């Protein structure tokens, strides 16, 4: 199963946080936020609150969120999938949690290999993720349309939101 | 706060998938709570017994409320899931809960209110001195008798007669 | 004599408390409530007293009840035949009293080993009488059709008696 | 939406007996009976208890059973979906119960009708459900392979599941 042939992100599956192995085309027809996510950084409120209020304001507008914790980065993330899920429980979390994955290097997710390096998931010096909380704007067909940095809070992406809804 | 508490039922505990239980559920019920883990000396001979028990008398009003604890000889150290499917080997019917800390300042109330029960003071402090130490609780809550940890839980069954 | 091969309780007799045998197909036309008894268990105020009240209600339907003593759950039926009879006497009881018995194990009365095989009268985890007060009715033709463990009380019955009458 | 143009069992859904939708998909991968129920029809015990012990027996090698209470034949399922799910609970029924569901006419669910019209789901004198538990052999890729009729006990069924394993 090579991740360069892929098409779209509802070709690849993912382990949900309760360890289920889910499809990725469940998204079809739906606009999604995915970003890796970590419960001890210095932006995990603004993101974990700001995700939550896109999420309530556009679930039904198709809006879905895809949150997967990753500890690559300042070792950000360090309990289990159990206190992660706590965690984002105490925000109302109310969209997809996943299991931990790594998101860089050779033994990150075929998922996260496919979006690095398409052409609105690309970064700017290189193709990394560079810090926690990075979001790609995936859109309908599961293709990812645009690329947020670590800084930018969730909000900015509102504005973006109406292009592909 | 846990030392002016009259039950069990005045507590709550994670089930082992993550939920809250009022243990006031178990009103009416007769319980054998146990610290339990699965790399210990004695976790067969344990479990089996229990799984016996509750087969025999869950009939009877017995409800078993098995606590993990890692904070004897490191003997339960993988998660909560991981230790539900070894639970689940043994065929277990009975409550399995979220691995809490039985001793020291981490412990959860409601052990910190077991541990100083009339009938739940140990010989030489009250300390939980090894895994699988056995409380029996009465219809109302109530510790009326403990177990040392290597009591085999079948020494149980010829008192649960008395609280049916 | 072999218990295996019976298809109704009307087959078999039993021992009354007056030490009488009775052929049980005197009951053949009459529902039945056939539980194990003690006198000295947590349940057996309530359990004499509504199968007395069942009895006062329905005897003119159609209900029998036949309360087998049985001293292997705790050792709380110690007493005497005679003594048990003066013990049920206090709660006015009108129907059935038995002799004690034996409800499992190899000495087990050959009909409680015929009842606990029936398929209505299965128990779950083994077909044993796991406690005091285990009830099973019995329909008109003498066959199990349904089993009821020690902690339903015996109104719990009451309405599934219409059903049989 | 029209019936007709399905290929499989997967493009439908179903409300479970808690009211839950439920994407029929889901049973992608497994052999299925789908049996039309009712509790106060005669041959209500036989089928509760084999479809039971089929389901504990098989298991394991992807027997699922999806029951749909139908009321349509001599009102034998007048209940409710909890009242429903409360009788299955009576018999250890640890297969997949659904709500109650019109099997015949105008109103039968989408998912009947089509089935009703499968070269393998019809019936000898038209293809209407005639009478409470039917049952409709279902293979891995969702298509309708046997229809057996309401008299026949679900245990003939066991020797045609190696074909679909």
């Not at 039904?60 to 070792?75: D, H, V």
Request: glycine fraction near 8%; hydrophobic fraction near 35%.
């Amino acid at each position: 199963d090579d991740w360069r042939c892929a098409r779209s992100m509802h070709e690849f599956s993912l382990k949900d946080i309760d360890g289920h192995m889910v499809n990725l085309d469940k998204y079809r027809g739906f606009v999604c936020i995915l970003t890796n996510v970590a419960s001890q950084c210095g932006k995990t409120e603004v993101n974990y609150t700001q995700l939550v209020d896109l999420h309530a304001r556009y679930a039904e507008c198709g809006l879905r969120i895809l949150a997967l914790p990753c500890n690559q980065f300042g070792k950000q993330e360090p309990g289990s999938n159990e206190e992660i899920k706590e965690f984002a429980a105490g925000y109302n979390v109310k969209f997809d949690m996943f299991s931990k994955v790594c998101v860089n290097g050779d033994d990150a997710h075929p998922l996260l290999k496919w979006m690095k390096i398409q052409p609105k998931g690309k970064g700017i010096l290189g193709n990394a993720i560079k810090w926690n909380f990075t979001k790609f704007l995936i859109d309908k067909n599961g293709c990812v349309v645009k690329r947020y940095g670590p800084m930018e809070e969730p909000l900015v992406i509102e504005k973006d939101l109406p292009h592909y809804f």
